[PDB]
Amino acid sequence: LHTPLGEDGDSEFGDLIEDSEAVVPADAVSFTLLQEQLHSVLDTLSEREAGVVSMRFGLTDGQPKTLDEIGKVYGVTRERIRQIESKTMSKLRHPSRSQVLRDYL
Amino acid sequence: FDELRIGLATADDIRQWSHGEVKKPETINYRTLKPEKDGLFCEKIFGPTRDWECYCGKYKRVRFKGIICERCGVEVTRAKVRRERMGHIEL
Amino acid sequence: ASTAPLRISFAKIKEPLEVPNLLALQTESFDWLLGNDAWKARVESALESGQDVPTKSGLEEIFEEISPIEDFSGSMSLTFRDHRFEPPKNSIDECKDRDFTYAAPLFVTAEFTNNETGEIKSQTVFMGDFPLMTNKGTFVINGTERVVVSQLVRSPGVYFDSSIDKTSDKDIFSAKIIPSRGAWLEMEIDKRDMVGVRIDRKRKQSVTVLLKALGWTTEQILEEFGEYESMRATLEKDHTQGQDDALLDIYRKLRPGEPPTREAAQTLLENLYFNPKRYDLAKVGRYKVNKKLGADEPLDAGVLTTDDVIATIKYLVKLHAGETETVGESGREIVVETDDIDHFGNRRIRNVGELIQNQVRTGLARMERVVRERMTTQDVEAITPQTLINIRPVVASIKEFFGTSQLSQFMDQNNPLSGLTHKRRLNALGPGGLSRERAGFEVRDVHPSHYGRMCPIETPEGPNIGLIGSLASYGRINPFGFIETPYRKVVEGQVTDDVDYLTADEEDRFVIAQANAALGDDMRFAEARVLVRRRGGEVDYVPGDDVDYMDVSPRQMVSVATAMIPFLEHDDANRALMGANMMRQAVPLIKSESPLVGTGMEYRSAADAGDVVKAEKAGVVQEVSADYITTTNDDGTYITYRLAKFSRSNQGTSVNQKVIVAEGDRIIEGQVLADGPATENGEMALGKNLLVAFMPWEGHNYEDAIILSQRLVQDDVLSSIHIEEHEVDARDTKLGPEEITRDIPNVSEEVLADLDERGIIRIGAEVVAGDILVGKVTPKGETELTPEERLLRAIFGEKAREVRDTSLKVPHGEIGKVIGVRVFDREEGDELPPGVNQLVRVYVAQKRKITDGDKLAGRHGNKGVISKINPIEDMPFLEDGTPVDIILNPLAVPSRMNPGQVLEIHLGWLASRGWDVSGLAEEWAQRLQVIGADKVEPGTNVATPVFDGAREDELAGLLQHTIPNRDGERMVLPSGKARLFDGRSGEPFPEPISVGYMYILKLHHLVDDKLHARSTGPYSMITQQPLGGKAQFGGQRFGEMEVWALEAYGAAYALQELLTIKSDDVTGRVKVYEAIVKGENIPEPGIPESFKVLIKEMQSLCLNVEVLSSDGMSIE
Amino acid sequence: NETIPRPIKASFREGLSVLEYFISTHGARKGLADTALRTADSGYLTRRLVDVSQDVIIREEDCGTERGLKLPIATRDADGTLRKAEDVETSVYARMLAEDVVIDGKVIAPANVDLGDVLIDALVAHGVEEVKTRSILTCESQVGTCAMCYGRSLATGKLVDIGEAVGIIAAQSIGEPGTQLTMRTFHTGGVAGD
Amino acid sequence: EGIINPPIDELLEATDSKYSLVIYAAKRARQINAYYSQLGEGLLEYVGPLVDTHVHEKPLSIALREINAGLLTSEAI
Amino acid sequence: VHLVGEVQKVYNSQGVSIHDKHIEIIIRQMLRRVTIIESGDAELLPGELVERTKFETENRRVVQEGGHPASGRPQLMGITKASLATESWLSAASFQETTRVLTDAAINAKSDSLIGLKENVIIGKLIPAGTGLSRYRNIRVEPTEEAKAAM
Amino acid sequence: ALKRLKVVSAFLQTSNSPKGMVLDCVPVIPPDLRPMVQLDGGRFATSDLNDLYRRVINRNNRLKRLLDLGAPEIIVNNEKRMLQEAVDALFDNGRRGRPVTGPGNRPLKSLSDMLKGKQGRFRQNLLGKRVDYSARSVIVVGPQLKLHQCGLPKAMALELFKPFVMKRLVDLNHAQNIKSAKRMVERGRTVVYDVLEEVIAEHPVLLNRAPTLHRLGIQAFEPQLVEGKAIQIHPLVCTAFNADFDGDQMAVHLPLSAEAQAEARILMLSSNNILKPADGRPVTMPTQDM
RNA sequence: GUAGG
Ligand SMILES: [Mg+2]
Ligand SMILES: [Zn+2]
Ligand SMILES: [Zn+2]
């Protein structure tokens, strides 16, 4: 990386290649706005529906939880949880609570 | 920030800084392109190459941070910790 | 006859000797190197003509130089007697297209002769591909046209120097014998009143011990040195005596730590100086040494001898004694004198052939070392010529020269003039020579010897001032490597026709007159008094018949680029320097037009340049079409020439070629049949001729700026095509192969509207910033989707497929219409580098018009940026109603001392509307009548040679007698000015203004390339400060000087943000972007990063740099 | 650095000749080389100046002492008249008068009042030959150098505010014309060291 | 309607320094900007713009306008 | 006076004119140091460079202690030597010559307090010159009671 | 004896013991400061410190191996000398004998070489840093401006103020969301340019020229949109920068914080710098044509 | 490396 870069002075091949680990502020703030808007639309729905979808898709922890995995803290059945998840997906699929999330993809 | 004191660095201080000890000239595998063990770029001395991914793969997710997997000994944290932690060679 | 179009000439003296082949420098040297048919033809032509010429080709010279290899037994040997070449497989255009180094095979007949077997075995062996010089002096390497430039250096031989030492209060004399390749030896006298020798400056020593070490005895040395008390003092002070004692002393001093040994010493000195391999003095070295030291015909080739050593000792001591004239040592009487290194007698230029010969010689020496090692570790009778050699050294070295070497430079194809001035330039920078930092005041400045050998005007005006220089117009190369110039022979006060070529030193002997000096009707001098020059650059005069040589033409000193400027004598030195430096940067336009006012040499500088397409047979044209022109000769050969259309040049400009010749026109051999870029009827045309007036105008032309009509924008008068080529490679990676395809992931359907099914954009589909040109997709990335993305996809019912888009897009700020796309594939017959499966290169071509910010300049060093393009009506319009196309500040002209531009303008006007002068009978009228420039029609060009240019009386008389343009009136007053009506207000201006035609060029410093802005972009890796440059969205640098300015104001906060938030702080940067876009106040910066890197580095040197606080440890 | 015996006998309007052009180039190229070298030397000098002078900062409103520095108000005073010095502007203007002045038993310039055209003109008219201007050399301040002694700045036309960077502006002012100096001995005269 | 819209000399006399003025105007502008970014939590400590406001504006211009009108004040701790 | 006159006559030759305060700052900076001679009671080395302020403090200390003061002489030194000799190692290292100064500071164990300009620019803190100064940073802005009454 | 006293006193006064003169363990750099980044095409790239570390490690290992087995004094002494040669190169290559050339075309950058010189860490990455929110372009004279006005091309202004333009677009409801606003600004529709013309005003930008000899090199201006791609500058202030118009280029920095813009309003304004500080004479009244 | 400043 300390090669002359073909230039006798003031240059180094080590100062011409961009990295990839660096966080792009644009993408980061877009993600933050996505998180806030999704949390807002999530609060718009019922608090119970909100909580169950959040725990299923893991919106507070990195790893999502399985259906029956939610039926221990909340004390519900593996098929009840599936049913409320299904009707949550049905409601969120409504064009009402989709537009604000369309551009986010 | 009130001063930047500088003095002669003894052997004990160099040991204190070190989070391990280098024992080989290895850097990476020629076929897997991953850092080798106990040489330069070793994960067990400097830090994981990817965010929260241990070398063996016992831990790969973000939730269970601040723990060392007994397989390879890597400590799951942000990759940026590599930029700070330092080792030391013995003579 | 019909070589060039009609052009009236204002010359006053007829040039005897026509300009030589402007590009002979490269082509002849390479022809000598190859030893092809042309070189032998020239050698025999010179020999029959009597001119000296080398009869030994460089390549066969180096191959014969490597003697047959002998082992410790010397049983076997290998002779490389003869080489040969065959037609190269690839065509020049094909090599340019497919990235192939244009080359031909090199076969040599190797003969292995062994005495132990007593047998000779002959075999033809292929040594390696050899790059070849095309007919235009350009080396096509990897599809890029490189050029190699001759290099000035100090020729080998004996040199002497005298200096003054303040401490000694007396002069100190020194000498050196600089070799071609071997180690260098120096010899100082009266350093402290004694003498000594530097053997590579190893240690202090005397001359006496060296002489004793040689076979010459003390007695004979005293006998030959008894006439100089200095040497007597040296030796009587010398305590040591005897050859062996001196030998062991010098051996111990040179290589201490081991006991002395007689044979070891003897062989070491022999290897150091008398071995023919270490100290091989070049042919020029001996040729110079014999003359400088006066030895009469020593060995033609060979290392230094003890006789030369004693001769230089004599020369040095004689120079010390104060004697000026002394008997030569084994030679005639000669002057003893310190020699100045700057003098062109001691400066020799390596041309292309010599450099390539040196590099291939190094390669062949490596080959000899390898094959000698192999022979030392090889068995007898398992030895063949084809097995023992190894072709790796030679090809490795030749490629390592043609790439990554200072003298191997990128061709500049801005216009044919740029090509020529790149070909001819001599560079003092290079390996084993005057580097950048080695420069001094003395070398850079001009010397009295750079006359007719190096133009003193054009040199880069940047830091490398004077370390590069163009070759003179009439210059020629000596076989040794010196530069000659012609001179007409003058006898008994008359002018003999014969011309003799003189070198740097030989010119010193005679006294040479000046071409500008008048010459009467007879061959004798018109005036007894005449200016001349003589030894040392003196310019004293000598009336009467005393001279013997005179410059063949007035334009000897000036180079080709400089000689383009008309009315050069009037301009200052600096402004002609700038003007010549600028003509190389012009860009060709959509349509070119030859200059109305300009020297008569542009035709030759165009024809000799390679860009034009000239016929090579004298035939008749049958069919004419833009793509190709078909001609037939009377012999019967049918030749069809292909005209290049819109092919990207090296710098990124079109190279379109037009067609001149009609269908039924005849042709003489060499006639131009098609223009290149910036050419018209075969005559150079780098710009266009505008109407111009000198007057301040509302402050829109303040401090060099320029104002011009919108007629230029409207008629495409100043418009240039520009083609950008960008490529992508379907590389294969560990996870899998990349695919170029139409199916791109996670994009709208509309963006993929112009893309073909294969995924490559169509031809002619206009593009804009952010568009898609070719659709490439990564095989896969390890995806660990985030919870928010998972929810969004589940709600929307889409699949995040592994393949990722990495398609090439048009770069930001770039527009254009695609004209051409080329595709190469692995599985097809085409070969690509390893790994890559497919490559696609796409052209985008646009037509940039002249707009605000574009630079502009003329030929006399007057340059400025456009500042306003006013409408057509706002321009102050002349009396008849013609607007003035461009307005120039007059304040610049007296201050910048370039009065010529003014003269040109008047003559320019004179060329637009023709002049009629018949029977007027005035002095200028008679001069015009005899010259022939008496009757002219409007629009015809005029030629004013660089130093034979028109005087002011002629211009005034012509202005007085311009042809009536309309209504029988002259719009310009005899003073040269005209009345200009205002455009905006409408009333006439108070006094007449100067107006006329001026040639203006469009420099390549356009505004489109320079613009750059950055909100946020890439960052650097080791330290996260944003990486600079327009090619990667770089941030401007806030320097130490710049910070000083901000600290002057007392402003502390602006500095803190400039140093922490805006860069070098990754944590705060995203926070600041969040705060801005959300709408809150900026947060509080923390510590930067580069300080952390620095303390970590300083901790790695065993220094425990602690960031402490007043109350113990600090918080960070 | 030599001189020829045969000067050019023509003007750029008339048009030089060949050898005349050559011997003009002789000086032109040397001039150009000098400018490039001068920029390297002036830039280096400016850098050195700032670093030694960076520490000083005006860190006190007014001084605690009274000692001053004597300057000549008016020099080259012809017979029977008083003439102000040619370079009074770069010497005593903008300073501060530490002690009060009395020539006819009455104050003419009150203490700690700047020196402009009117005050200096009145003082020289009264016939004063020298004055005691306050200056930074004799300034005694525990912290840096007080504003009162430094006088008034030049870019503002008013007394210097506390905390201004006087060292950096001083160094920049010294270094700015270094490029503009561009002068050298036209001829050595055949003697080295004289 | 410009950066130089409030003449500087009046601001300078009230403040007494060329640096105290910038610090004090900047603090006021920060307060106003954070008030406009309050978005409704309604902290009592914050206060609004005393002088009338345009539909689009920068807080610093309003701050400097108050200083010129002199309705504010400062007191070093 | 000789130095200022010499430099000014050098400058005005072409025509450029600068005030004398600018030169006087530097000329004062040169002579700040002093050469201690007869360093008997002061107990430090003799004939080595010494800051004027520390010289005065040491002289006051020793005369208070009852011992006589070590002598000293003014010493004019170039700008370069003066910059290298500065108390703060970090600023000195940032100057042209780095290895020697870093080595000497390391062996001497000199803790650099961050007072100054070129020391704080690297750390990214606020330079203590003008708006960055302490007294100019710790005010509070309050609208007047009558202003809040106005609304 | 004076120099010896000086150095001896230093050890005596400071707690650090002299044994640190001779080190015993060699610290290593954290790896990201010596990155072995991956390049497209199967190639690689590495900072030279890796090579020096490898050499010292190899030689130490071989010395250890030779010490475990009974070995001659000559060989072990030679190896220890080699280890000394290696560690010294790591601290500073080329301070003794011939510099480790490595590939042969150039010396090898050691640890000390990064802290010293024109390209060193001090004088290229702690004093003079690069910065975002900036631009550059050729200049042309603008006489119709005032003493505090400069013309910026549309593209330059748009790329400098992108966050502000996006926030304004979402506030005016032209853009539905931040992502859609970003899409619209990258597309560059006329509504974006209208919003830009609204937002730039009453916000100072610092124009600057490269040599910046004296503190008038950086001056604040109130921006103004204009077509073309060349900045427009006021003639009067041109002579203060020493700015010709043959062909020039000027950086245009942008202050963001409240303090920075306040400073550019009060101090660095182009109208409050009439007098040059060298001699207290006016500098903003040029004379070429007027 | 070479151009422009
Ligand atoms: Mg300029
Ligand atoms: Zn693991
Ligand atoms: Zn004071």
Swiss-Prot record, chain A:
The keyword DNA-binding applies. Residues 41-94 are annotated as: Sigma-70 factor domain-4. Keywords: DNA-binding, Sigma factor, Transcription, Transcription regulation. GO terms for biological process: DNA-templated transcription initiation. GO terms for molecular function: bacterial-type RNA polymerase holo enzyme binding; DNA binding; sigma factor activity. GO terms for cellular component: cytoplasm. Disulfide bonds: none annotated. It comes from the Bacteria. Residues 67-86 bind DNA. Sigma factors are initiation factors that promote the attachment of RNA polymerase to specific initiation sites and are then released. This sigma factor is the primary sigma factor during exponential growth. Its activity is stimulated by RbpA. Belongs to the sigma-70 factor family. Homotrimer (Potential). interacts transiently with the RNA polymerase core complex. Interacts with RNA polymerase-binding protein RbpA via its sigma-2 region (residues 211-347) in a free form. This is RNA polymerase principal sigma factor HrdB.
From Swiss-Prot, chain B:
This is DNA-directed RNA polymerase subunit beta'. It comes from the Bacteria. Zn(2+) 1 binds at residues 54, 56, 69, 72. Belongs to the RNA polymerase beta' chain family. The RNAP catalytic core consists of 2 alpha, 1 beta, 1 beta' and 1 omega subunit. When a sigma factor is associated with the core the holoenzyme is formed, which can initiate transcription. DNA-dependent RNA polymerase catalyzes the transcription of DNA into RNA using the four ribonucleoside triphosphates as substrates.
UniProtKB/Swiss-Prot annotation, chain C:
The keyword Transcription applies. Signal peptide: none annotated. The RNAP catalytic core consists of 2 alpha, 1 beta, 1 beta' and 1 omega subunit. When a sigma factor is associated with the core the holoenzyme is formed, which can initiate transcription. The RNAP complex including the principal sigma factor HrdB also interacts with RNA-binding protein RbpA. Keywords: DNA-directed RNA polymerase, Nucleotidyltransferase, Transcription, Transferase. Its EC number is 2.7.7.6. GO terms for biological process: DNA-templated transcription. The keyword Oxidoreductase does not apply. The gene is rpoB. Gene3D superfamilies: 2.40.50.100, 2.40.50.150, 3.90.1100.10, DNA-directed RNA polymerase, beta subunit, external 1 domain, DNA-directed RNA polymerase, subunit 2, domain 6, RNA polymerase alpha subunit dimerisation domain, RNA polymerase Rpb2, domain 2. GO terms for molecular function: DNA binding; DNA-directed RNA polymerase activity; ribonucleoside binding. This is DNA-directed RNA polymerase subunit beta. GO terms for cellular component: DNA-directed RNA polymerase complex. InterPro entries: DNA-dir_RNA_pol_bsu_ext_1_sf, DNA-dir_RNA_pol_bsu_external_1, DNA-dir_RNA_pol_su2, DNA-dir_RNAP_su2_dom, DNA-dir_RNAP_su2_hyb_sf, RNA_pol_bsu_bac, RNA_pol_bsu_CS, RNA_pol_bsu_protrusion. It catalyses: RNA(n) + a ribonucleoside 5'-triphosphate = RNA(n+1) + diphosphate. DNA-dependent RNA polymerase catalyzes the transcription of DNA into RNA using the four ribonucleoside triphosphates as substrates. Belongs to the RNA polymerase beta chain family. It holds the Pfam family RNA_pol_Rpb2_45.
UniProtKB/Swiss-Prot annotation, chain E:
Signal peptide: none annotated. Keywords: DNA-directed RNA polymerase, Nucleotidyltransferase, Transcription, Transferase. This is DNA-directed RNA polymerase subunit omega. GO terms for biological process: DNA-templated transcription initiation. GO terms for cellular component: cytosolic DNA-directed RNA polymerase complex. SMART domains: RNA_pol_Rpb6 (SM01409). It catalyses: RNA(n) + a ribonucleoside 5'-triphosphate = RNA(n+1) + diphosphate. Its EC number is 2.7.7.6. Belongs to the RNA polymerase subunit omega family. Promotes RNA polymerase assembly. Latches the N- and C-terminal regions of the beta' subunit thereby facilitating its interaction with the beta and alpha subunits. One of its GO terms (molecular function) is DNA binding. It comes from the Bacteria. The RNAP catalytic core consists of 2 alpha, 1 beta, 1 beta' and 1 omega subunit. When a sigma factor is associated with the core the holoenzyme is formed, which can initiate transcription.
